[PDB]
């Protein structure tokens, strides 16, 4: 849920895989844009969802093209 920062829209370009193993689920994220895994880990939800970084890293054109201008109304 939205406890702290806001902007979990990047998730729309990623999907969490099942645990199907000893390690608890929600360990990695599968990019629905290209299909690359993007882990997060501790201390990640600090505004710019680790995902975003990947989206603007390669999908920079996708973000700009889409109706997504700025992702920080009260952040700099
Ligand atoms: Zn990707």
Short mmCIF file of C-alpha atoms and ligand atoms in Angstrom, two decimals:
data_model
loop_
_atom_site.label_atom_id
_atom_site.label_comp_id
_atom_site.label_asym_id
_atom_site.label_seq_id
_atom_site.Cartn_x
_atom_site.Cartn_y
_atom_site.Cartn_z
CA UNK A 1 0.00 0.00 0.00
CA UNK A 2 0.90 3.68 -0.26
CA UNK A 3 2.55 4.20 3.13
CA UNK A 4 5.36 6.55 2.15
CA UNK A 5 6.45 8.04 -1.16
CA UNK A 6 4.10 7.78 -4.14
CA UNK A 7 4.82 6.63 -7.68
CA UNK A 8 4.53 2.85 -7.92
CA UNK A 9 3.39 3.24 -11.53
CA UNK A 10 6.64 1.74 -12.80
CA UNK A 11 5.39 -1.60 -11.48
CA UNK A 12 3.03 -1.58 -14.46
CA UNK A 13 6.13 -2.54 -16.46
CA UNK A 14 7.13 -5.37 -14.13
CA UNK A 15 5.62 -8.53 -12.64
CA UNK A 16 6.60 -10.36 -9.45
CA UNK A 17 7.33 -14.08 -9.80
CA UNK A 18 6.25 -16.87 -7.42
CA UNK A 19 8.53 -18.11 -4.64
CA UNK A 20 8.46 -21.73 -5.83
CA UNK A 21 11.49 -22.10 -3.56
CA UNK A 22 12.82 -21.81 -0.02
CA UNK A 23 13.36 -18.06 -0.34
CA UNK A 24 10.18 -16.06 0.24
CA UNK A 25 8.39 -14.68 -2.85
CA UNK A 26 8.66 -11.13 -4.18
CA UNK A 27 12.45 -11.40 -4.49
CA UNK A 28 12.77 -10.36 -8.13
CA UNK A 29 10.73 -8.44 -10.69
CA UNK A 30 10.16 -9.43 -14.32
CA UNK A 31 10.09 -6.46 -16.69
CA UNK A 32 6.96 -6.68 -18.85
CA UNK A 33 8.65 -4.31 -21.31
CA UNK A 34 11.75 -6.28 -22.28
CA UNK A 35 11.62 -9.28 -19.96
CA UNK A 36 14.62 -8.63 -17.73
CA UNK A 37 14.74 -9.36 -14.00
CA UNK A 38 15.17 -6.36 -11.71
CA UNK A 39 15.77 -7.10 -8.02
CA UNK A 40 15.06 -4.51 -5.33
CA UNK A 41 16.19 -5.53 -1.86
CA UNK A 42 16.13 -3.53 1.40
CA UNK A 43 15.69 0.24 1.36
CA UNK A 44 14.42 0.60 -2.19
CA UNK A 45 11.11 2.47 -1.94
CA UNK A 46 12.75 5.89 -1.68
CA UNK A 47 10.68 7.71 -4.30
CA UNK A 48 12.24 6.53 -7.55
CA UNK A 49 11.21 2.87 -7.56
CA UNK A 50 14.27 0.83 -8.55
CA UNK A 51 12.17 -0.04 -11.60
CA UNK A 52 11.98 3.54 -12.88
CA UNK A 53 15.77 3.60 -13.10
CA UNK A 54 15.54 0.67 -15.52
CA UNK A 55 12.63 2.25 -17.41
CA UNK A 56 14.56 5.48 -17.95
CA UNK A 57 17.74 3.48 -18.53
CA UNK A 58 16.54 1.67 -21.65
CA UNK A 59 12.83 2.46 -21.91
CA UNK A 60 13.62 6.17 -21.64
CA UNK A 61 11.82 6.67 -24.95
CA UNK A 62 8.79 4.70 -23.77
CA UNK A 63 8.33 6.87 -20.68
CA UNK A 64 8.79 10.16 -22.54
CA UNK A 65 6.51 8.98 -25.35
CA UNK A 66 3.77 7.80 -22.99
CA UNK A 67 1.74 10.24 -20.92
CA UNK A 68 4.38 10.29 -18.19
CA UNK A 69 6.12 13.65 -17.90
CA UNK A 70 7.50 14.10 -14.39
CA UNK A 71 7.37 11.59 -11.54
CA UNK A 72 8.03 13.97 -8.66
CA UNK A 73 5.50 16.68 -7.72
CA UNK A 74 6.92 17.36 -4.26
CA UNK A 75 10.42 15.94 -4.75
CA UNK A 76 13.69 17.20 -6.20
ZN1 LIG B 1 12.91 -3.64 -19.20
#
